[PDB]
């Protein structure tokens, strides 16, 4: 931990999706997850450019975004554009779409200054994506490139999501909450790992952090709140790597998982799983019993047997660090495509937490492999 | 009069396609807001390297939603080689659909019995084809010819969902019922209704069934089972028509709304409205309560005084025809564009009921602004 961070950052921010249609993703998101519809921005607050909605659990700030027919802003240029995030483009946005399907577009951190952060990026070797731009004399925000057609987004405070977003009226908004908090980390799929941390460990200054078809190393901020590790490849395996097949699906690079910190993971997994096949998330299939009885034999003096008969009925992966304990488990993918999804974390020990209790769980390729050839033989 | 002047047999609707850009989404929202169950498939996960569709069902009531893959999935095929369970499919014309229109309505699907006559015949009496017969398996034949805007009237026939379609697995399969059954009317919006309904009554031999804003007529088969209603704007001086901000903001003419017929609506708005605010959706702001208060005089001899308590506690409208009574209500839009909504309604009359018992709520039109002057009062 150098803390050789080349701006000050502090804490992710939120995570956008660019969709097709953002009403109806951003519904199915909201009762798979547990999350509040908090603010929109759209035809009814003045946008002519784009429908954008926000959704909340706890910190954790999900947005959705599509555009609207071009006509309707056929009479606006980029500087008198109706548009609440200036940074959006129709072209770029059906781009995306296009070429990669329902997927994030932005993965943005919170930081002291934006503008300062941005030509520090630049200055550094970061391509820049949107130059700095500031909102109602409140916000700033600026996007530089990350990985494929995914950005990193700044926004900085002067002195309710942006300026020209309206907060949801509470009579269409339910208060829902399954106990997601925290974004924990977002996950890069890329095809050469070298290149992508060169590049942007390069311009932000972050520490690296302390087979079976891939390659990993994590990126980290000072405190180690902001987690950003990347994946590549490994080829010519056995099987074919599952890193391949989100790069050949998703037309290159890009933004491989989300994971969500849940205050407790077991009532976050009980309430997804009694919504997956009503409108919410599927889950990877669960481990066999093999796995569990050897969970007594690695984690028995952090969970009790109770415990462990419960992660056997959600169907939870544990793993273990030289700190803590890290408990997770997969959604399958949440679009057409076999590219994002999310996955659902409690950490345990290390204490604030600190980040990265527990890791991430890589020691859990090998034991799968292990408990399922056990299984299969008994 | 039904002068029954079907060019081709017509049995009923069969199922309405959605384009979007993500399947899943919208077929999930659907599920869950509409009460409709998981049933059938095509994707990557049974061979289908072109496009994903997901169908939902409600009693015959069949949704199909539809996305496109990377066409880098599929380009070594050609037509004849294709893993796409429906050949009239193609990249470009679907991801040229949504940026023009949003989410929406795509292909109208009716039932024949012969679909390759049913194209000629059509063609042979002004339809446009947009995609003339091709034969699945051996078993099904589909069509299509144009019917307004980018949305084509499809027709399906069986020798005795589709081929290449795959059940879905019991365990993603939730028996999910509000108790609607099939659809009743699917309507249009275009800007001149005339050359429309020539067009459109010109190749099927639909016959006709027989201000605020729109002027519209209604095209039937021979017994009145598929029902299609088209709506012109009526420009005037006073308001700007809704049926013009439809025009606008789907970029010309296409699918107004889809009408569902449920066997107890008091028990599916129930449901739906249960849902509203956490994934399904929204309904039109209710009338005034003048507007019930008006009721028992004008169903008082239908309905209940305890059935039309319940129409108000959610907001539904009532019309009465020369022969029957209608129950109905209205979605806000199903997406982000406002255009196409959904309207859920229950016929009473006509007894086996007979199609478009009780109109299409015309009568709401001068009903609903009689009862706004009277609630100002
Ligand atoms: C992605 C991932 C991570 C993970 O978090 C990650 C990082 O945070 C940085 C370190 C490197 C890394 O791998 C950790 C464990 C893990 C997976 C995993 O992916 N799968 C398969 C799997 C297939 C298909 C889907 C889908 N849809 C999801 C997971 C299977 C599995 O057994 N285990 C245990
Ligand atoms: C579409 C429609 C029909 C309808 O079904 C139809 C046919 O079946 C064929 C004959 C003519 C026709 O109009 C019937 C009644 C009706 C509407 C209607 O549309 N709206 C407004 C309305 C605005 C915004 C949205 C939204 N979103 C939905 C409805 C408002 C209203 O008071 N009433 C009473
Ligand atoms: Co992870
Ligand atoms: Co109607």
Redesign the interface.
């Given at each position: 931990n150098p803390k050789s961070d080349k701006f000050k950052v502090k804490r992710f921010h939120h995570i956008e999706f660019w969709?097709?249609?953002?009403?109806?993703?951003a519904?199915?998101?909201?009762?798979?997850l547990g999350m509040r519809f908090s603010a929109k921005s759209?035809?009814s607050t003045g946008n002519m450019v784009h429908?954008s909605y926000l959704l909340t659990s706890g910190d954790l700030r999900f947005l959705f975004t599509?555009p609207?027919?071009p006509?309707?802003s056929a009479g606006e240029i980029k500087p008198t554009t109706t548009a609440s995030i200036p940074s959006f483009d129709h072209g770029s946005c059906?781009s995306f779409?296009?070429?990669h399907?329902?997927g994030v577009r932005a993965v943005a951190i919170e930081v002291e200054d934006a503008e300062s952060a941005f030509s520090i990026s630049v200055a550094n070797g970061a391509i820049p994506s949107s130059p700095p731009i500031v909102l109602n004399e409140a916000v700033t925000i600026a996007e530089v490139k990350l990985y494929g057609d995914v950005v990193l987004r700044y926004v900085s405070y002067k002195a309710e999501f942006l300026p020209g977003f309206e907060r949801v009226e509470d009579?269409?908004?339910?208060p829902?909450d399954y106990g997601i908090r925290r974004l924990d980390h977002a996950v890069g799929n890329v095809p050469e790992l070298g290149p992508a941390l060169t590049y942007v460990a390069g311009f932000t200054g972050f520490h690296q952090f302390a087979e079976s078809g891939l390659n990993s190393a994590v990126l980290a901020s000072n405190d180690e709140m902001v987690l950003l590790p990347i994946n590549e490849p490994v080829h010519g395996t056995k099987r074919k790597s599952q890193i391949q097949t989100y790069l050949?699906?998703n037309?290159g690079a890009g933004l491989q998982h989300l994971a969500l910190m849940s205050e407790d993971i077991f009532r976050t997994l009980r309430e997804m799983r009694k919504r997956?096949?009503?409108?919410?998330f599927?889950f990877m299939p669960s481990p066999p019993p093999t796995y569990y009885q050897n969970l007594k034999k690695r984690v028995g003096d952090v969970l009790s047997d109770d415990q462990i008969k419960e992660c056997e009925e959600l169907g939870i992966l544990v793993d273990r660090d030289d700190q803590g304990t890290l408990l997770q488990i997969f959604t399958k993918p949440?679009?057409?495509?076999?590219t994002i999804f999310i996955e659902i974390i409690q950490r345990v020990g290390c204490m604030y937490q600190s980040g990265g209790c527990g890791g991430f769980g890589k020691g859990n390729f090998s034991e799968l492999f292990k408990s399922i050839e056990e299984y299969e033989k008994t």
């Open positions: 969709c097709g249609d953002a009403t109806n993703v519904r199915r998101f909201s009762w798979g759209d035809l429908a599509a609207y027919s006509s309707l059906r779409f296009s070429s399907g329902l009579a269409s908004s339910f829902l050949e699906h037309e997956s096949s009503i409108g919410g599927d949440l679009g057409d495509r076999p």
